[PDB]
């Protein structure tokens, strides 16, 4: 249990979770604000 | 022991085939020879310089003789735009009848090679017109080469052999080379241009026979010595002037028109004569700087000694560097190579954009071949300069004598230099590759408008400063201010005509593809410099191997211990940097060749459209322009490009064979040779014949070199075949 949490806190698992979430947010931003060549003004 | 390593006992007693290889390799490394004194070192270097200068002159005389004897120089001079130059006759026993009938170009009656070296345009521009003139020149250079061979022989005799101190006399050497080797030579070339090349360009042939009877200017030397030097610029050549004829031919011998001669699209010969004259004056003045035997002039040691920053930011300044440079042949060699490589790059970058030879701009294959030639030579020379500086740091650098000067300071903050080189290289490569991949994806996804196309406004702004009126900045020469007004008296009308014309390549229009490729070039230069500076500064030791200076310049490794030390030597840093040098030079010349091919077909939009993404280079440049090359020979006969197709595939072969030596390493091959030794020893009727030298695998450094040589040879030959065949198939 706690050890499993520690296992999750390992570098590979944490890298995979962090990049999964990051890719998710970036994909969602490119879905809701798509095709952004430059910052509008 | 054997006699071939006459200079190396340690190789003479070597019982293996490595003896032969390393005696070939270390032949010209005079400093590491048995019983070698400094005096013998310097005398042998002097005579070797004599020797290969004679080689250079024999090469030039051979080119002249072959063009005179087997070429079509006269006919080419008659119609420069519709006659392909001839290099030399081919007598190949292996040719078939289609090969003999397909290589017969020009007006030759035998198979020939089409001279892509530009020697025809150069010799036509300098006033040579007939095969007799070229033959006379070849014979004269044969005599010059014999003279230099005799001079090398003579200065190797003990009476005429000079001491070390004669070579160490820096002031006299530089005074004489600046005034005489540079300055007076430029003056003599000006005298040639004024007396021979310009009159030949204006129709009248001035050879030695009618030399001393035809004044180069209608006025004599009266305007010269009376100070009315502007008489020599009174009447320049008319715009409607045909080269080699008297139509619209002026009388001015020296001027600064600028731009290009309209009929030849090359520099005005009067401009180039005035140019060499000004250089002659500047360099003759410059060659009186240093003090030799007459109580006046500077002392270079004291020049360096007195240039120390008062704040101490530089440390002890340049104190102690005079002896460092003068006693270190590798320091001098690295400096000379650095400069020579920069010059070779400058020649590549100036001959394409400012062609100095008549009818060179119209011959596109020669332009491409010359640019590729000088850029690859420059890159190799640069790699040599940095390698020899690493060698200087190992063999010739004295930390005790150089204590506190800028060089020891370089050793002190080497980590900062290497780390910032790594940073700039990483930034450039990440962002350039990312922008290229992004553009690849956007083109792939059918939305090319979403590409990151950064307009290179800084280079465009420079061009606007320099007279280009495309972009509309209009600041310095494109605008109307003091700089342009000062320029518009002598040079600027011709310069503006040249730079704003769409035909020439004086300052080509710049787009986002040019941005991305120049940043790729910057990546290549920064990374090659990273590798080479790292090799030079860690040459004397690093944290992995503190005592690297005790192992010489080139050693295989320091064993598998301490994690592994493969490719740890500075020689290995050079070996690694040659790959990056070839890569960078290929990027530059790919850019050159594609941009110029687009210009020469008249559709520059192709490059400007397809150079922003890598698939465009792979498709519209490499795949597209390789069609006629690979069709040099096929099942339906062959044509004149079959030799270049064969060389293309040849270079591919060498490149791959190099990959063998680079990837597979010694110890597999050593065991394989051991099994082969057993087989030969136990084969009946073959054990009658026995090797004198024990067959062994190539050593680690040797094989690294062999693989690098194959890599580079295949690289150069493949690209030479491509750049020549495609350009000749589309333009001749």
């Amino acid at each position: 249990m706690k050890n499993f949490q520690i296992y999750l806190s390992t570098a590979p698992v944490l890298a995979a979770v962090w990049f999964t979430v990051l890719a998710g947010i970036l994909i969602e931003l490119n879905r809701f604000f798509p095709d952004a060549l430059s910052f509008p003004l | 022991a054997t006699k071939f390593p006459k200079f190396s006992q340690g190789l003479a007693s070597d019982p293996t085939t490595r003896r032969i290889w390393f005696g070939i390799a270390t032949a010209h490394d005079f400093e590491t020879h048995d019983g070698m004194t400094e005096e013998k070192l310097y005398q042998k270097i002097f005579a070797s310089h004599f020797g290969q200068l004679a080689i250079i002159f024999l090469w030039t005389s051979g080119n002249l003789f072959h063009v005179a004897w087997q070429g079509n120089f006269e006919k080419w001079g008659e119609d420069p735009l519709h006659v392909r130059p001839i290099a030399h006759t081919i007598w190949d026993p292996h040719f078939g009848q289609p090969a003999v009938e397909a290589f017969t170009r020009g007006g030759a009656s035998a198979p020939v090679n089409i001279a892509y070296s530009g020697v025809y345009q150069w010799w036509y521009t300098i006033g040579m017109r007939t095969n007799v003139d070229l033959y006379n020149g070849s014979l004269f250079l044969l005599f010059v080469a014999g003279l230099f061979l005799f001079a090398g022989w003579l200065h190797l005799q003990p009476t005429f052999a000079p001491a070390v101190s004669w070579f160490k006399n820096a002031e006299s050497r530089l005074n004489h080379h600046l005034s005489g080797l540079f300055g007076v030579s430029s003056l003599a070339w000006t005298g040639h241009l004024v007396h021979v090349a310009i009159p030949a360009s204006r129709g009248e042939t001035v050879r030695w026979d009618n030399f001393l009877t035809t004044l180069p200017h209608p006025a004599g030397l009266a305007p010269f010595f009376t100070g009315q030097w502007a008489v020599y610029a009174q009447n320049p050549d008319t715009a409607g002037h045909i080269f080699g004829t008297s139509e619209g031919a002026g009388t001015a011998i020296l001027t600064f028109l600028g731009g290009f001669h309209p009929q030849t699209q090359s520099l005005w010969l009067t401009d180039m004569a005035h140019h060499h004259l000004a250089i002659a004056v500047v360099f003759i003045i410059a060659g009186h700087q240093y003090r030799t035997n007459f109580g006046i002039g500077h002392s270079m040691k004291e020049i360096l000694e007195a240039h120390t920053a008062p704040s101490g930011r530089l440390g002890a300044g340049h104190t102690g560097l005079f002896d460092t440079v003068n006693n270190s042949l590798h320091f001098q060699l690295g400096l000379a190579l650095a400069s020579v490589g920069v010059l070779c790059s400058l020649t590549a970058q100036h001959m394409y954009s400012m062609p100095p030879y008549a009818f060179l701009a119209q011959d596109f294959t020669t332009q491409a071949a010359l640019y590729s030639h000088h850029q690859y030579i420059a890159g190799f020379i640069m790699c040599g300069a940095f390698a020899h500086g690493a060698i200087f740091f190992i063999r010739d650098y004295d930390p005790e004598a150089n204590k506190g000067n800028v060089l020891a300071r370089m050793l002190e903050h080497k980590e900062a230099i290497i780390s910032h080189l790594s940073w700039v290289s990483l930034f450039l490569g990440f962002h350039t590759l990312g922008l290229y991949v992004h553009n690849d994806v956007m083109q792939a996804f059918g939305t090319p408008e979403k590409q990151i196309l950064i307009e290179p406004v800084f280079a465009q702004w420079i061009q606007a400063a320099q007279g280009k009126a495309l972009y509309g900045f209009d600041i310095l020469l494109s605008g109307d201010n003091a700089a342009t007004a000062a320029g518009n008296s002598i040079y600027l009308p011709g310069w503006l005509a040249g730079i704003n014309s769409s035909t020439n390549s004086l300052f080509l229009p710049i787009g986002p593809g040019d941005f991305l490729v120049h940043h790729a070039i910057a990546l290549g230069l920064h990374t090659t410099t990273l590798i080479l500076v790292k090799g030079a500064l860690d040459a004397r030791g690093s944290k992995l191997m503190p005592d690297k200076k005790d192992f010489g310049y080139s050693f295989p490794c320091d064993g598998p211990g301490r994690g592994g030390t493969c490719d740890i030597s500075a020689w290995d840093a050079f070996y690694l940097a040659v790959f990056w040098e070839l890569n960078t030079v290929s990027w530059t010349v790919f850019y050159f060749h594609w941009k110029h091919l687009a210009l020469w077909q008249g559709n520059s939009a192709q490059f400007d459209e397809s150079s922003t993404y890598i698939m465009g280079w792979l498709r519209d440049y490499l795949w597209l322009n390789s069609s006629q090359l690979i069709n040099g020979y096929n099942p339906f006969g062959m044509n004149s490009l079959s030799v270049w197709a064969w060389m293309f595939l040849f270079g591919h072969l060498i490149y791959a064979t190099g990959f063998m030596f680079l990837i597979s390493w010694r110890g597999y091959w050593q065991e394989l040779i051991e099994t082969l030794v057993w087989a030969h020893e136990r084969t009946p009727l073959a054990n009658f014949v026995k090797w004198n030298d024990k067959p062994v695998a190539l050593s680690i450094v040797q094989a690294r070199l062999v693989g690098l040589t194959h890599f580079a040879v295949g690289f150069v030959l493949t690209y030479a075949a491509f750049v020549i065949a495609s350009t000749s198939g589309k333009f001749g």
Binding site: - | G10, S13, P15, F555, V677, W678
Partner: protein, 80 residues
């Protein structure tokens, strides 16, 4: 043959000697270290140059160093 040099930082741990595959190195009495012994390279002619001694030397920087030089039959490790 190659050149093998022993430096006074040697602690006499004998690992260079035990690692040598050609018996080039030997331990000799010496007062300089605590262990009371320094390595030496009498049979330098037999040094193939494999640098196992340098890999097995614990002292920083190495007390044994092999400098590759003239290559002989024995140094090249040839059975022929």
């Amino acid at each position: 043959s190659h050149a093998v040099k022993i430096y006074d930082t040697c602690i006499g741990c004998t690992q260079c000697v035990r690692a040598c595959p050609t018996d080039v190195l030997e331990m000799v009495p010496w007062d300089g270290c605590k262990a009371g012994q320094i390595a030496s390279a009498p049979r330098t002619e037999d040094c193939v140059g494999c640098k196992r001694c340098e890999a097995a030397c614990p002292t920083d920087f190495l007390s044994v160093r092999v400098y590759l030089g003239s290559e002989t039959t024995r140094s090249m490790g040839l059975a022929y």
